C-alpha cells in the first residue's frame with residue numbers, strides 16, 4: 280500500500296483494487312455514498328454495509344467518521360474500489376470500540392465509492408444552494424450578518440460569464456450591488472481564504488424577476504466561483 284497520511288507516518292496505507300472514472304474527488308463538506316467491509320488485521324470481519332439495505336452515507340471532513348476515512352475518501356474517484364489499512368491513531372486508538380473493535384487495533388477496510396454531491400447550505404435542505412469547496416480557507420471564523428467582507432466573484436449563467444468583480448460590502452446590503460440573496464447566504468458559510476463554487480436555484484438567485492442588465496431571464500439557475508479574501512465580523516446582540 281501507498282502511504283497517504285498527511286504526516287507520512289504510515290498511519291493510512293491504500294491499495295487500489297479497481298480504478299474509478301473521471302477526475303473529481305470528494306472534498307470537505309461533500310456528501311459521500313459508499314459500500315464498505317471492515318476487518319481486524321488477523322482477518323476477523325466486524326462489519327459490512329452490504330449486509331444492510333442502502334449505501335453508507337456521510338459528510339466528508341466534518342469528523343463524523345474515523346480519521347483514516349476522511350483522509351482516504353478524499354483520494355478516491357467515483358467507481359473506485361480500494362483497500363485501506365488504518366493504524367489505531369487513525370481509527371479507535373486506546374479506547375477501541377467495544378464489542379467489535381478491541382484496544383489499539385489496526386483496521387482494514389474495503390471501500391467502493393458510488394457517488395458524491397456538494398453540501399446543501401439551505402435552511403430548508405431543498406437543494407437550492409449547493410457548495411463545492413475547491414480549496415479550504417485558512418481560518419475557522421465565518422462572516423456574520425452585517426460583516427464587512429472582501430470577495431472576488433465570477434458569476435455564470437449557462438456557462439457564460441455575466442459578472443466578474445472584486446467587492447467590499449456589508450453582508451445584508453448585497454442586493455444594492457446586484458448580488459443575489461443566496462450568494463450572500465453562502466458567503467456567511469465561508470472561511471477566510473476559501474475558494475469555492477456555489478450553485479443557486481432560481482428561488483435563491485434572481486427568481487421570477489431575473490436581472491436584465493446581466494442578461495439573466497426569469498427563473499434562472501446560476502453558478503458562482505468565489506474567493507473570500509478577508510472580513511471583519513459585525514457586532515451582534
Ligand SMILES: C=CC[C@@H]1/C=C(\C)C[C@H](C)C[C@H](OC)[C@H]2O[C@@](O)(C(=O)C(=O)N3CCCC[C@H]3C(=O)O[C@H](/C(C)=C/[C@@H]3CC[C@@H](O)[C@H](OC)C3)[C@H](C)[C@@H](O)CC1=O)[C@H](C)C[C@@H]2OC
Pocket residue numbers: 315317325326327335343344345348370371372376379380
Ligand atoms: C447515531 C447512532 C450511532 C451511529 C451509527 C450509525 C449511523 C450506523 C453506522 C453504519 C455505524 C455502524 O453500525 C452498523 C458501526 O460501524 C462500525 O462497525 C464500522 O464498520 C466503522 O468503523 N465505521 C462505519 C463506516 C465508516 C467508518 C467507521 C466509523 O467512523 O463509524 C462512525 C463512528 C463509530 C465514529 C466514532 C464516534 C465516536 C468517536 O469517539 C470515535 O472517534 C475515535 C469515532 C459512525 C458512522 C458514526 O459517525 C455514527 C454512529 O456511531 C463501527 C466499528 C461501529 C458502528 O456502530 C456504532
